[PDB]
C-alpha cells in the first residue's frame, strides 16, 4: 500500500498488522527489511516512521 | 489497566523481561475504539531521554527504573479522548551506519495491551 | 655531494598534516564535553580524561619513543605515528552508542600512544632533510601542524555535532565527526607509507653530513641545574595551566552562556590562534633581542594578567569580552612556550635540546593533569570563578619564581668568544 510523508522520513518506515483485539505485529521495519518473526491474512495494517522525535502511524488501512 | 473518573492520575506500568530496558527504547501507544493506533511517549532508560506527543503536551509523563526492567507512563488529567487500550512496544538502538546498512528498527516485541477506560 | 631534495617539503607538509589530525583528537571530545557526557551519560571528569589521556600517555613513553626512533629510524616512528592514529580514529566508530565509553577512551588511548611518536619527530625531521638555513621554518611548520589540529578540533567538532538530547540522532552526528577523521587519518597514514623516505639521497645539511660520519645520563645532569630545575616547574606551571584552560573551556563557556557550544569552540580557536601570533612575535623579538630571562618574565606576568582579566570578567554576561580576554590570554599563554624552551637551551648549553625539551614537555603534562582533575574539582563544586582563581594562583607562584631565574646564558657564552 501507499504511505507517502510531509516530511523526509528516509526509509524509517515500519508496517504493522492489526487483527481486531490483539497488539500489532512488526512486518516490514527500515521500510524494506522483512521482519522474521512475522514474515510474509485479513487485518487493519499501520505504516509508521520512526524518523524525528515524535513517532507517527498512519491513518489505518482494514 | 483500570477504571478512572475523568480528572484524574493514572500509572500504567510496563515490564520487561529477556532483554535489558536500558538497551532499548520504550514506546507507549494507544488505540481507542475506531480510531486505530497512536503514538504517546517513549523513553531511553539509559540517557533518561524522553519523547512525547503534541496530544498529551503536559499531562502525561514517561519513565523507567532500569533496575527492575520496567517503564512507566504515568496521567495527571485525563479526558474521555484519553481512553483506549495502550501498548507497550520497544525499538532498538538504530546504530549510525550511514548508508551501508542504514537500519532503521521497528517495535518488534509489542505489548499485550492494557485497557484504561 | 650536500643537497636538498624537494621531498623535503612533502615529507614535512604530510607529518604536518596526520601531526595536525591526532591534535583535533586530542579536543574532538574536550570542545563537545557538555555533550558526550549526555551521550554517554557520564561526568565531565571522565569526558576530561579524554584529554587527559594523551598528558599521560607521554610521560611514561617519552623515553621509549626516543629510543625507537634512534634504533629503528625516521620512516619506522612515521609508519608507527600514522597508523596508531588511524588505527585509534577507527576504533573510536564502534563506540557510537550510549553504553561505550570504554571504546572511545580505548580509541582515544591509542591515539594519545601515536601522539608519542608524533611529538618526537619535528626537530628530527628537519635535521635529516633540511638545510641548516631552514631547520627552523621546518621545525616551525611541523609545530604549526599540530597547534593548526588543536584550534579545528575546538571549532568543528560543535559544528558537527548539535546539542540534542535523542540518543541515536546525537549518535549520527557523532559518526559523522568519526568517519571524516577516520577517513584523514588514514588517507594520510597510506600517504605516509608512500611519501616518507628514510633520508635524503644526500645530506642536506653539512652538519648532517659530519653526524652520519645517552639520554638518561644527561636527565641527572639537568637535576643539578637549579636554574634548569626552577625553569621546568615554572614552563610546567603555565603549560599546564594551558592545557587545563583547553580541557575546561567548553564546562566554565557553558556554565556562564548556556547554549553557545558553536562559540565555545570560536573562543577556543580564538585562544589558539592568536596564540600563534604570540609564539610568532615572542620568537621573532628573541631571536632578534637576545634578552631571555626579561622577555620570559614579562611574558610570564601577563599570562598572570590576562588570566585575572579572563577569571574576573567572565560573569559580566557579554561573550564578546570573553573573545578578547580568551584571545589575549591565549596570546600570552602559547606566546611563553617559544621562550621556555630557548631560555632552557640556553641555560644548559653543553646538553642536548631534546632532553630539555622533554623534560620541559613531561614537566607541562604533569601539570596539565594536576590541573585539569583539581580544578574541575573546584569548578564541579565551588563555581567557575573560584576554578579560575585556583589558575590565577599557580601563575602567580610562576611568575614569582620566573624572576628568580638567573639569566645564565651558556649558548650566548659559547658561541661568541
Ligand atoms: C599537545 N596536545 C596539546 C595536543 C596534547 C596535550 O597533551
Known amino acids: 500500500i501507499t504511505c507517502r510523508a510531509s516530511q523526509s522520513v528516509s526509509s524509517a518506515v515500519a508496517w504493522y498488522q492489526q487483527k481486531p483485539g490483539k497488539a500489532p505485529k512488526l512486518l516490514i521495519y527500515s521500510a524494506s527489511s522483512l521482519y522474521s518473526g512475522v514474515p510474509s491474512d485479513f487485518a487493519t495494517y499501520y505504516c509508521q516512521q520512526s524518523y524525528g522525535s515524535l513517532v507517527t502511524f498512519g491513518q489505518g488501512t482494514k | 489497566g483500570g477504571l478512572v473518573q475523568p480528572g484524574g492520575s493514572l500509572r500504567l506500568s510496563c515490564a520487561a523481561s529477556?532483554?535489558?530496558?536500558?538497551?532499548?527504547?520504550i514506546h507507549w501507544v494507544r488505540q481507542a475504539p475506531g480510531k486505530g493506533l497512536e503514538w504517546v511517549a517513549s523513553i531511553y532508560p539509559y540517557s533518561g531521554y524522553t519523547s512525547y506527543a503534541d496530544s498529551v503536551k503536559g499531562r502525561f509523563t514517561i519513565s523507567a527504573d532500569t533496575s527492575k526492567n520496567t517503564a512507566y507512563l504515568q496521567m495527571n488529567s485525563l479526558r474521555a479522548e484519553d481512553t483506549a487500550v495502550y501498548y507497550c512496544?520497544?525499538?532498538?538502538?538504530?546504530?549510525?551506519?550511514?548508508?551501508?546498512?542504514?537500519?532503521?528498527?521497528?517495535?518488534?516485541?509489542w505489548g499485550q495491551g492494557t485497557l484504561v477506560t | 655531494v650536500i643537497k636538498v631534495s624537494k621531498r623535503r617539503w612533502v615529507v614535512v607538509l604530510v607529518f604536518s598534516c596526520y601531526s595536525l589530525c591526532n591534535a583535533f583528537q586530542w579536543i574532538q571530545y574536550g570542545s563537545i564535553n557538555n555533550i558526550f557526557m549526555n551521550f554517554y551519560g557520564v561526568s565531565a571528569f571522565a569526558i576530561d580524561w579524554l584529554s587527559m589521556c594523551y598528558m599521560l600517555t607521554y610521560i611514561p613513553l617519552l623515553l621509549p619513543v626516543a629510543w625507537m626512533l634512534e634504533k629503528f629510524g625516521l620512516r619506522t616512528i612515521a609508519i608507527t605515528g600514522s597508523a596508531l592514529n588511524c588505527l585509534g580514529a577507527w576504533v573510536k566508530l564502534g563506540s557510537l552508542e550510549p553504553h561505550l565509553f570504554p571504546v572511545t577512551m580505548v580509541g582515544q588511548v591509542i591515539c594519545s600512544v601515536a601522539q608519542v611518536f608524533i611529538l618526537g619527530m619535528p626537530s628530527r625531521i628537519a635535521s635529516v632533510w633540511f638545510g641548516a638555513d631552514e631547520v627552523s621554518t621546518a621545525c616551525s611548520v611541523a609545530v604549526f601542524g599540530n597547534q593548526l589540529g588543536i584550534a579545528i578540533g575546538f571549532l568543528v567538532p560543535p559544528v558537527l555535532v548539535p546539542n540534542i538530547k535523542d540518543p541515536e540522532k546525537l549518535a549520527y552526528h557523532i559518526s559523522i565527526m568519526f568517519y571524516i577523521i577516520g577517513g584523514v587519518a588514514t588517507f594520510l597514514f597510506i600517504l605516509v607509507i608512500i611519501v616518507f623516505k628514510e633520508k635524503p639521497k644526500h645530506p642536506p645539511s653539512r652538519a648532517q653530513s659530519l653526524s652520519y660520519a645517552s639520554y638518561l645520563s644527561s636527565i641527572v645532569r639537568l637535576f643539578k641545574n637549579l636554574n634548569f630545575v626552577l625553569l621546568v616547574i615554572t614552563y610546567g606551571l603555565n603549560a599546564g595551566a594551558f592545557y587545563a584552560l583547553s580541557t575546561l573551556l567548553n564546562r566554565m563557556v557553558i556554565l556562564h552562556f548556556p547554549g553557545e557550544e558553536v562559540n565555545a569552540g570560536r573562543i577556543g580557536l580564538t585562544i589558539v590562534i592568536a596564540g600563534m601570533f604570540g609564539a610568532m612575535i615572542s620568537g621573532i623579538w628573541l631571536d632578534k633581542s637576545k634578552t631571555y630571562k626579561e622577555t620570559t618574565l614579562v611574558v610570564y606576568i601577563m599570562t598572570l594578567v590576562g588570566m585575572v582579566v579572563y577569571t574576573f570578567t567572565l560573569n559580566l554576561n557579554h561573550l564578546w569580552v570573553v573573545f578578547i580576554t580568551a584571545g589575549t590570554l591565549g596570546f600570552f599563554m602559547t606566546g611563553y612556550l617559544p621562550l621556555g624552551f630557548e631560555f632552557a637551551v640556553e641555560l644548559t648549553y653543553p646538553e642536548s635540546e631534546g632532553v630539555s625539551s622533554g623534560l620541559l614537555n613531561v614537566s607541562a603534562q604533569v601539570f596539565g593533569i594536576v590541573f585539569t582533575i583539581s580544578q574541575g574539582q573546584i569548578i564541579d563544586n565551588h563555581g567557575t570563578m573560584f576554578g579560575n582563581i585556583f589558575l590565577c594562583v599557580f601563575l602567580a607562584l610562576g611568575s614569582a619564581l620566573t624572576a628568580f631565574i638567573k639569566s645564565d646564558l651558556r649558548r650566548q657564552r659559547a658561541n661568541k668568544d
Open positions: 529477556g532483554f535489558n530496558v536500558s538497551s532499548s527504547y
Open positions: 512496544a520497544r525499538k532498538q538502538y538504530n546504530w549510525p551506519w550511514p548508508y551501508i546498512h542504514s537500519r532503521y528498527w521497528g517495535f518488534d516485541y
